[PDB]
Amino acid sequence: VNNVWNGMIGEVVYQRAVMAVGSLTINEERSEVVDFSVPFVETGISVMVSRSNGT
Amino acid sequence: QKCDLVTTGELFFRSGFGIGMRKDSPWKQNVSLSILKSHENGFMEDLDK
Ligand SMILES: *[C@@H]1O[C@H](CO)[C@@H](O[C@@H]2O[C@H](CO)[C@@H](O[C@H]3O[C@H](CO)[C@@H](O)[C@H](O)[C@@H]3O)[C@H](O)[C@H]2NC(C)=O)[C@H](O)[C@H]1NC(C)=O
Ligand SMILES: *[C@@H]1O[C@H](CO)[C@@H](O)[C@H](O)[C@H]1NC(C)=O
């Protein structure tokens, strides 16, 4: 936001907290200013469907 | 591809295919950044399709 980071990444970039853990998405824009690690659980822009009945 | 063989079971040991390089290679950061950018813009989608 206006060349300013906020939240978890905001508190990590200003070196007020060394490591950050939680539900954080690996992203290109975030990898520029912050260094990530090897992912442990996959994610993406997924779709879900209501379970249709049998036919 | 052939319809004579079938997968079975549920996938285990989720890992990620990766481009490995010697530890002192200076290309690491840019390789990773470009690979993430390719994931984001949808070029990986086109290559998969
Ligand atoms: C990773 O990709 C980066 C893409 O921006 C790149 O940053 C920019 O790279 C260019 C050239 O690679 C630099 O241009 C510099 O090149 C001459 C070499 O004679 C330098 O003397 C000058 O200072 C000139 O700026 C950019 O400066 C550079 N930008 C930044 C912000 O660093 C990286 O160089 C790439 N790194 C690797 C290891 O591939
Ligand atoms: C599937 O069948 C149930 C009956 O058990 C019914 O209540 C439900 O509406 C059916 N699904 C749809 C999408 O209509």
- Spell out the residues 6+ positions from residue B28 whose beta carbon is closer than 8 angstroms to its own: B21
Distance CA(B44)–CA(B49), nearest Å, equals: 8
Element (H or E) spanning B38, and its range? helix B28-41
Tell me if A26 and B36 make a contact (CB, 8 A cut-off): yes
Distance CA(A8)–CA(A23), nearest Å, equals: 10
Method by which this entry was solved? cryo-EM
Distance CA(B5)–CA(A47), nearest Å, equals: 28
Q: Quick count: other Cβ atoms within 10 Å of Cβ B27?
A: 11
CB-CB contact of B33 with B26 (8 Å): no
Distance CA(A27)–CA(A25), nearest Å, equals: 6
Whether A25 has a binding-site annotation, put simply, is: yes
CB-CB contact of A34 with A23 (8 Å): no
Residue A24 class from Cβ within 10 Å (0-12 exposed, 13-18 middle, 19+ buried)?
Answer: middle
Tell me if B36 and A39 make a contact (CB, 8 A cut-off): no
* Tokens 């779709």, residue located: A47
Resolution value (Å, 1 decimal): 4.2
